[PDB]
Write a protein that binds this DNA or RNA. Structure first.
Lengths: 64, 68
DNA sequence: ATTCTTAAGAAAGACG
DNA sequence: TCGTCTTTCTTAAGAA
């Protein structure tokens, strides 16, 4: 309506909708962050597995 | 003018496009959430493999360095 | 020209 | 009752 309680309610709702959308937008980028971070660590751990396996076979050929 | 029939068709075409694009995003978000779980499981499998090999390599060293 | 993507506003419940 | 938060529908502007 042409009220004034309506105008303040619309303004407060617009504030609330913007806040709720920016919050939900970061939670989706936060999940996208974890994908790039877990892919970083899983590739570091995979290099560590190869490193340890290499040194185990180097150490085991001392038996020859 | 600005409420022609070109306006109605364009706005009805855009409504269909917004629903299609919004459905793709929610799906793309849901696939990312599932990627996190399988990467977490793989991260746990790799951490346990590292510790297993770390203990195996440690014990094998202690044997060589304890040579009389 | 089009479709696709993004941000915004409005209204209705959900919630405390 | 009041409030804020969350969700659906739609529009408008701009990117592709």
């Amino acid at each position: 309506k042409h009220s004034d309680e309506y105008k303040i309610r619309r303004e407060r709702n617009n504030i609330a909708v913007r806040k709720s959308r920016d919050k939900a937008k970061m939670r989706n980028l936060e999940t996208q962050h974890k994908v790039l971070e877990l892919t970083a660590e899983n590739e570091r751990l995979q290099k560590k597995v190869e490193q340890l396996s290499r040194e185990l076979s180097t150490l085991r050929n001392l038996f020859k």
